[PDB]
């Protein structure tokens, strides 16, 4: 067998190459972060009118001032999110302090890393690093507002703007030009929805888009239905000039 132990000819881990394709199938998630708020907007998958769109979630609270988006294998990513939650509470106990987004990002990668092959310095009970990527966002003083993109590689990069999932490639191409330092919260919100309709297979609705923010004022706060609708409605009026 092709273990974690045994590498590809190049020297890459097998699981890292495979996990790229796994994420690709996943749900599109778009992140634009600014110093006026992190805006996370995600595509909600829907197969029936009969599915109830309230119950499902793809933005998941990990902590009072920490929001996350997930893509990849969802069921593995459901555990990933449970343990991330544990880590945060455990730090809060030790220092009486809200974890830096950046440290939290590292603490999660340390926990995906641990296999099944059988070490001699470490505890084994998995088989692989999770083949899921996450966008870990949040607010703290030192760095201001942050957005991180964690890879299955065991590598974290901070981003201004990052798109993962199906629409990874086409959303990123626009986000390079359109993202700026000048942008504020109301600016950012409209842009995300605009990119989202092009990469959405069907129509854009407020009932298959879910927006949230991390602001330091509110912490993690999921937007109600009404705000979401209104920014869609506002975007329509401008599109019909053309």
């Amino acid at each position: 067998d092709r273990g974690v132990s045994t590498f590809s000819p190049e020297g890459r881990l097998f699981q890292v190459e495979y996990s790229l394709e796994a994420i690709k199938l996943g749900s599109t998630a778009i992140g634009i972060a600014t110093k006026e708020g992190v805006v996370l907007g995600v595509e909600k998958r829907a197969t029936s009118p009969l599915l109830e769109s309230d119950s499902i979630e793809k933005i998941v609270e990990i902590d009072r001032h920490i929001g996350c988006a997930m893509s990849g294998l969802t069921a593995d990513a459901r555990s990933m999110i449970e343990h991330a939650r544990t880590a945060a509470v455990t730090h809060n106990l030790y220092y009486d302090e809200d974890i830096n987004v950046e440290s939290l990002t590292q603490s999660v990668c340390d926990l995906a890393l641990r296999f099944g092959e059988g070490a001699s310095g470490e505890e084994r009970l998995m088989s692989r690093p999770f083949g899921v990527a996450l966008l870990i966002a949040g607010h703290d003083a030192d760095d201001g507002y942050q957005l991180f993109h964690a890879e299955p590689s065991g590598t974290f990069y901070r981003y201004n703007a990052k798109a993962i999932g199906s629409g990874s490639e086409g959303a990123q191409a626009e986000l390079l030009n359109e993202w700026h330092s000048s942008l504020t919260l109301k600016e950012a919100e409209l842009l995300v929805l605009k990119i989202l309709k092009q990469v959405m297979e069907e129509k854009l609705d407020e009932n298959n888009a879910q927006l949230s923010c991390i602001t330091k004022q509110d912490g993690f706060k999921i937007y109600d239905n009404e705000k979401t609708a209104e920014l869609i409605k506002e975007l329509k009026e401008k599109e019909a000039a053309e």
Partner: protein, 240 residues
């Protein structure tokens, strides 16, 4: 015992096991849930064809997990038995430690975490088992109908079909129920569940179980004479 990797990702980014698990679900005989705003109505096919099988002591798919939380399935009949016991201990563990019976929402996550552990471990094959979980949340009468996948994902659904031939059954629910307003009464809702099941069952009144669970831990089973009563109405629609 076993602990070696079987969670080896394809180069098509999927666990092989999880795929096979999906294949298994289908084969298990259909189960249907459509919730009203005043009930949850559960239908399922059971084996009773065989002359010289006594149904009283042949196990019933529909399972008490709590007085107000019930569970049905499609999938491996061996693995469900294990599943049901796990839920029963958890259900009681909540009354022991946090007090009050499981909130339904909490048991759905418990059931899902078992499947997830099987994918975290390379040793343990996921069960090839999907379940319908239905009940009334504590201190409340709100009907919940939940659905699972054997891969460890859960979601709430207004109506559901799992098991054999979901195609014909799905197409019927898209025309016969609409989400804007649920069936008004228990009687209107029983009729739709019944109508849907008979599509892929073909008649019977003796073989099929319909179990209505209403609020405040009322579980009551339909007599064969009551089942037929709904069939008698529907025969007239089909004629006109």
């Amino acid at each position: 015992g076993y602990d070696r990797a079987l969670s080896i990702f394809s180069p098509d980014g999927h666990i092989f096991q999880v795929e096979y698990a999906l294949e298994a679900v289908k084969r298990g005989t259909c189960a249907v849930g459509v919730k009203g705003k005043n009930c949850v109505v559960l239908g399922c096919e059971r084996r009773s064809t065989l002359k010289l099988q006594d149904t009283r002591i042949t196990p019933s798919k529909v399972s008490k997990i709590d007085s107000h939380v019930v569970l049905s399935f499609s999938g491996l009949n061996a693995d469900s038995r294990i599943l049901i016991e796990k839920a029963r201990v958890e259900a009681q563990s909540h009354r022991l430690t946090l007090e009050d019976p499981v909130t339904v929402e909490y048991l759905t996550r418990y059931v899902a975490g078992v499947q997830q552990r099987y994918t975290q471990s390379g040793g343990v094959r996921p069960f090839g088992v999907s379940t319908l979980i239905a009940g009334f949340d504590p201190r409340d009468d709100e009907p919940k109908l939940y659905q699972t996948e054997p891969s460890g994902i859960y979601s709430s659904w207004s109506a559901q079909t799992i098991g054999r031939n979901s195609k014909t059954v799905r197409e019927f629910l898209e025309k016969n129920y609409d989400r804007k307003e649920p069936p008004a009464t228990v009687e209107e809702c029983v009729k739709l569940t019944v109508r849907s099941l008979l599509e892929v069952v073909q008649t019977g009144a003796k073989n099929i179980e319909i179990t209505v669970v209403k609020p405040d831990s009322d579980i009551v089973a339909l007599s064969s004479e009551e089942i037929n009563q709904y069939v008698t109405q529907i025969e007239q629609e089909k004629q006109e």
